[PDB]
């Protein structure tokens, strides 16, 4: 199962609604997690099981999707959300996505 | 049953027509270790055990001797010297639901791997850290079971599969599970090598004149020689006249 | 009389045969039943089957429970009738449960089998019509050594009589010290 | 709650290195514990996992060369690396697996050249 | 894992003394003729040692 994460880079502004897409080569039910990683820092778990926001993560991050197409939704981007985001297939071979870098729009 | 709570059925005192299994096209996995299912029709066993459960396709490989993983370690484990058969078939049409069937569970945490044929159904809160949980979930305190997500649109690896493991057990007791052991037609007035219920010989079978009792099977002459037999299917008594011979 | 219980403990600790004829139905079970102290009737199962003078023979050989039976009319109260009759086989259970003790479920009579040699007379119709116990008396010994229910006059050699020992004598020298095997097997150097 | 890993270093190809991961607030032997690495400028790659029951598993790129283990008395996870290659150069994190990993260490840097 | 060493796993009958069989005919483990095509119940008689 191949995880295709798109786009590689996306530019957004503070307060925007951001949509990151992770595409699996076939149906993986809801077995997907999302991570956030900032330069020089360890990854941070945001959502597990495709639609369970991890405790303490702000309400902005919203996860949804089922089957073969999954999305991470940041309802209101804040300054500390510019980072790289990774999807990971769960209950399998821990395959990771290529990552999406969210950068400052200008 | 769920894999963590795999059901076991004991088969005893019957005829096991294994052909119905190994001639069936309804099974995608049929792998027997240490035994050929064709030869099972010629063998008897004290007991047979059918361990039935449901997993996902990618986990089917874990149902085999010397295998590791979630299912092998925490749900169902086969011995390294396992003798018997493993049968598995897709059950997407039966165990999947459009909204997702979560009735099937698997054990996600356990303090140690299962021993062969061990069954663990406890719902104890799993203590992942050094703080005792005392039955209360929280940080480092997790439920040991998790539901499968079975939808009809799931990939074949994630689709449900029903698995039955047949194991054979011989004890210090009579073997009561036996194969078919079919028979053939019988011919009279011709020299035949015959094998009735438990006895074998050579001779000519002829219509008899005796009146065997309802419970008598094998005749006997004065000099401890088989004389007549009761045909197991037809309630007729056959005299055994040994085939002609003599000096030249 | 209604049925029988066979087993070793018969207290739900090990399998035990239960045979009961409930008034139209014969039932045989081998479950680990939990029995009462006095299991009377109102005035893990590995097998289950469902179907004047009466004689039965129960025995257990090589895991097989043989049950032979015979029925006959009688006009007598105070004792068994004198006469001869053979018992046919009815059941051969492959149960495999070893029995040590048993109990009845309701006047009756109980005897215990012994490994004896018998001479059986089969008539033209395959049925036993008479028997001779080969160890009952000298005449029966002669009958079973000649293999004929009637023996004509004469002197026959049947067996050999030998006295039996009355006491067992064991003699050995009186030594106490243990053999120093330890110094050899537990020797530091070989 | 913290994961403190150490042992990364510069080493020649074919060399050996053991990484240690001291845990606090979590019992390594009672958890799914993993090593995950990140090559310079690349994404995350799962390396190895040890089950609570003791079973171990490895990514194909490291199979036969890396060994994961743990010490209960020290509450510490280990990654023993043999026959190191240039492509093993990465920051190595130890993580607690709930595949969804919620507790990460700060990482230790391995350079093979 | 060296798999160059093979062993025959199926045969229609037991070998006679000092008999040598190197044939690669497809063993028909079921009732369906194989016609030289491997598949379900149609096996290559040899299997490699691990
Ligand atoms: C056995 O089955 C045959 C038919 O297959 C039948 O004709 C015959 O009566 C049966 N015998 C007994 C003893 O039931
Ligand atoms: C033996 O049975 C036949 C009929 O089956 C009968 O005519 C005969 O009288 C019987 N023999 C005796 C001694 O009663």
Numbering used by the authors:
A (entry chain L): 2 to 107
B (entry chain B): 348 to 595
C (entry chain C): 101 to 143, 165 to 172, 188 to 242, 264 to 347
D (entry chain H): 2 to 99, 104 to 118
E (entry chain A): 447 to 496
What is written in the article reporting this PDB entry?
S from both SARS-CoV-2 and SARS-CoV-1 uses angiotensin-converting enzyme 2 (ACE2) as the cell surface receptor (Hoffmann et al., 2020, Li, 2015), ACE2 is expressed in a number of tissues, including epithelial cells of the upper and lower respiratory tracts. S consists of two subunits, S1 that mediates receptor binding and S2 responsible for viral and host cell membrane fusion (Walls et al., 2020; Wrapp et al., 2020). The S1 fragment, at the membrane distal tip of S, includes an N-terminal domain (NTD) and receptor binding domain (RBD). Although both regions are immunogenic, the RBD contains the interacting surface for ACE2 binding (Lan et al., 2020).
